[PDB]
């Protein structure tokens, strides 16, 4: 999905293995905040949110808590106390088109900043001046969305990148999303300290 229309997937009751993703060189960016990226499989939270979108390379640095810019202010804002991970990878071979791609958009103007995890897809004409726009674009009246125009020949800073932000939400409810929790071999007839199911 476009960055301004970021898609959200809800994850309840499913084991996941963040070790095969952390060990993958395919992902150009793997940065976690509030939780160590190494120690990830042990953690347990009741729900998981997966926000997904596409940006350009120069904006990948903007997907982090406490950041500012077009994307952070007008497209996708992360809270300061965000507890989760941000993963990004170069999608030039998929989301770039010769002549420029028109499918991925981003909000260019907005009168106020987005709240954390807010989703704004309004196409109201931005009034930059004192004269009120009446639905028609013009001087000081611009369309809020702009196309990235992703091309395969673009610079890697302007090439398309697919970004997925995983957040782990714990509420006043049982924790239903759990890690792999691998096991080991068992030995008999020897004094052992054991850890069975619970």
């Amino acid at each position, epitope marked *: 999905a476009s960055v301004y229309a970021w898609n959200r997937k809800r994850i309840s009751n499913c084991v996941a293995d963040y070790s095969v993703l952390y060990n993958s060189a395919s992902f150009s960016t793997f940065k976690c905040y509030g939780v160590s990226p190494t120690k990830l499989n042990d953690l347990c939270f009741t729900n998981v949110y997966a926000d997904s979108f596409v940006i350009r390379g120069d904006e990948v640095r903007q997907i982090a808590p406490g950041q500012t810019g077009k994307i952070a202010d007008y497209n996708y804002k992360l809270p300061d106390d965000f507890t989760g991970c941000v993963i990004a990878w170069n999608s030039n071979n998929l989301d770039s088109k010769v002549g420029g791609n028109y499918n991925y958009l981003y909000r260019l103007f907005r009168k106020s900043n987005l709240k954390p995890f807010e989703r704004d897809i309004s196409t109201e004409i931005y009034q*930059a001046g004192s004269t009120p726009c009446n639905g028609v674009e013009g001087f000081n009246c611009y*369309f809020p969305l702009q196309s990235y125009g992703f091309q395969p020949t673009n610079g890697v800073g302007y090439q398309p990148y697919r970004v997925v932000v995983l957040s782990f939400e714990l509420l006043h409810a049982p924790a239903t999303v759990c890690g792999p929790k691998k096991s080991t071999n068992l030995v008999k007839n020897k004094c052992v300290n054991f850890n069975f199911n619970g």
Partner: antibody
Amino acid sequence: QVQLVQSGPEVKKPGTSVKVSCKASGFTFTTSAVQWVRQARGQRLEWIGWIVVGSGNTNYAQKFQERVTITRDMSTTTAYMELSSLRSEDTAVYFCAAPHCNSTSCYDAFDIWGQGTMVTVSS
Amino acid sequence: DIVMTQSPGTLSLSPGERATLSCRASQSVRSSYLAWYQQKPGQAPRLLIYGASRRGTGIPDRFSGSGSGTDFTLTISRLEPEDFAVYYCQQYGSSPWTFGQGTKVEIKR
């Protein structure tokens, strides 16, 4: 120092191209617009065209739709005007104009103007 | 296209008199998208009036503006020696943003 500085004088042969620069200062370039206007020696002002800096959208006059292309580069806060297939009729002084703007709003007219760039085209 | 016509061609006036310039559009234009500029020989244009009736920054208060639709007026209450130059009116609402042909204000003698 809300400034708008243009290129120096240009002297080109007929059939060539000239690219006039126009650099902004003082205001936030990213949210403004830049127009280009020409004036022949002792003549009136002839509007060439304008560009929105944030989007890059351009509108040209009928008489310059064919040989003028207005561009911009927000990194170097500079806008350019490329004029292809020069001829003696193009010998004039060229101005760039822009409203000064802060991070969110703009002025309601073209109050910042460049010093002018004289382009002479002959053999 | 919107055609901008200015008058008079040459305004021969004495320093201290009241100057009055006219600007006519071939079709009705927005008052909030018309400007008046001053240009001296060998100099760049200087913004005088915008929004038909909004004085610009640094422009003396003797410059005024009025009009609506197709007819607009630039009024100089008391003409100063530093005011003798060329004056243009431009509409910037409907593209192309055409200019006028200019008005030369000379010192009468």
